[PDB]
């Protein structure tokens, strides 16, 4: 029955991390027709308004959204990565990448300038392998990343497959 | 394990109709954090541009959207339902309801004038009950439908449960 196949999907979903859930949600959106996408667009808007109207999330959401699209902030995190706190900085990059807005070239470039350094550091095992794969997962399906950017990045994906 | 959990979910989904897919996707969005909602917002804005850029689905998508929000199209359809073609008109309404834009009061009014007539018709077995149950399902979680609207529609929902 439906409430039983829905409960199965909800259970496996809550067994997924935020990257995993977002990637699958992107896959499922591909199995939908226009009316459904439009309905979900309006629904995400309501959820976003609610999230920004409560202290449990409002400040946390505004700052991450701005930081993720702020070339000055990102350049400083890159500058800080080369030296240390690489792992922590990559977690921050993984949490901000989903918010990168299509058309923000200034910020996209900084992002695409760190992934190579992150890939090289996983091959020396300076940083965890799963984190860079999670970041790469987003880059492959990201609405802000062009096919041209993905070509320049394939030279780094093989090392992760 | 992950690719497998995803293949399970994906299969249960493709075994679902559009209304079940849209309602489940709505519930899963409530289990996402802000960065994920933004990614999916930008992602749909690509999949939507995708549909409106390919003959396969561009025209049909543009038309059902205008029709679902055009009081002149909707009024003319209500005037034709009363008489006949109820099942086909009800199917058209179900296909169009998800595209009702929040703030479109003129269009919303006509949708809410037809729902009573259709619940009465399902009780006299003039129309299939499944269709009306799917219409009320969208109405219960619809961003364009207010709490007031819901309370005014509660008398007709009891009969459907």
């Amino acid at each position: 029955l439906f409430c039983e196949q829905v409960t199965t999907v909800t259970n496996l979903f809550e067994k997924w991390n935020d990257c995993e859930r977002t990637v699958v949600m992107y896959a499922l959106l591909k199995r939908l027709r226009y009316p459904s996408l439009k309905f979900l667009q309006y629904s995400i808007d309501s959820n976003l308004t609610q999230n920004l109207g409560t202290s449990q999330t409002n400040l946390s959401s505004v700052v991450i959204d701005i930081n993720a699209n702020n070339p000055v902030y990102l350049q400083n995190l890159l500058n800080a990565y080369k030296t240390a706190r690489k792992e922590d900085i990559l977690h921050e990059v993984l949490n901000m990448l989903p918010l990168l807005k299509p058309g923000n070239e200034e910020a996209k470039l900084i992002y695409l300038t760190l992934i190579p350094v992150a890939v090289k550091d996983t091959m020396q095992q300076i940083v965890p392998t799963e984190l860079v794969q999670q970041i790469f997962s987003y880059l492959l399906i990201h609405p802000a990343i062009t096919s041209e950017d993905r070509r320049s990045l394939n030279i780094w994906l093989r090392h992760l497959e | 394990l992950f690719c497998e959990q995803v293949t399970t979910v994906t299969n249960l989904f493709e075994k679902w109709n559009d209304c079940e897919r849209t309602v489940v996707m709505y519930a899963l969005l409530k289990r996402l954090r802000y960065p994920s909602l933004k990614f999916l917002q930008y992602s749909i804005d690509s999949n939507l541009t995708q549909n409106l850029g390919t003959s396969q689905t561009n025209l049909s998508s543009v038309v059902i959207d205008i029709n679902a929000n055009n009081p002149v199209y909707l009024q003319n359809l209500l005037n034709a339902y009363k008489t006949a073609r109820k099942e086909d008109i009800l199917h058209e309404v179900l296909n169009m309801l998800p595209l009702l834009k929040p703030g479109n009061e003129e269009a919303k009014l006509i949708y809410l004038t037809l729902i009573p007539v259709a619940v009465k018709d399902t009780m006299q077995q003039i129309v299939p009950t499944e269709l009306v149950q799917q219409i009320f399902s969208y109405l219960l979680i619809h961003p364009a439908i207010t709490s007031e609207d819901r309370r005014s529609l509660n008398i007709w929902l009891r009969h459907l449960e």
Partner: peptide
């Protein structure tokens, strides 16, 4: 497909 490529990386990372 790039989405398939992404699920493989996400597979490995679990």
């Amino acid at each position: 497909d790039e989405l398939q490529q992404a699920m493989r990386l996400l597979n490995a990372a679990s």
